[PDB]
Amino acid sequence: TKEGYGKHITSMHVRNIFNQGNQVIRNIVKQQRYELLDFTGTEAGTTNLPKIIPY
Amino acid sequence: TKEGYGKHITSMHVRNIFNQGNQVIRNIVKQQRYELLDFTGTEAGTTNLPKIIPY
DNA sequence: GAATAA
DNA sequence: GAATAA
Numbered sequence: 001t002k003e004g005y006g007k008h009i010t011s012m013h014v015r016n017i018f019n020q021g022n023q024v025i026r027n028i029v030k031q032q033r034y035e036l037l038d039f040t041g042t043e044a045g046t047t048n049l050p051k052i053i054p055y
Numbered sequence: 056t057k058e059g060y061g062k063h064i065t066s067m068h069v070r071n072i073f074n075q076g077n078q079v080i081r082n083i084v085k086q087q088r089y090e091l092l093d094f095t096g097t098e099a100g101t102t103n104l105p106k107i108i109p110y
Numbered sequence: 111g112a113a114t115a116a
Numbered sequence: 117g118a119a120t121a122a
Contacts, residue, residue, distance in 0.1 A: 001056055001058070003057070005066070005067055005068045005069055015118055016118045016119060017118065017119085017120095018119075019118090019119060020119040020120090021119090022119080022121055024120085024121065024122075026122080068112080070112055071112045072113085072114095074114040075112085075114090076113090076114095077114060077115055079114085079116075081116080
């Protein structure tokens, strides 16, 4: 007979404890920025022109 | 098959019968003492003075 | 608070 | 949607 004593012991079933490559981490990129919009200038991006948000 | 007859017999589980160092004995130190308090003297601890209990 | 906590 | 899907 194959028998033995132990604690937190069990007949051995399938164990592969590596995930099958499924895991998800979640960060939020957080980029608060104080900015200025200057239309008072003649230079490049400072003009009467609409300033763009390139989402 | 592994089997045998016996009395007060069991499949063998974990047995270490030494305690993990936890045991408590309790005595009371008992020290009744008849004593005298003498303030009638001039010598050392015999005076008008309060005699002390140094618990 | 089988490994001794009266 | 024992092999990680918060």
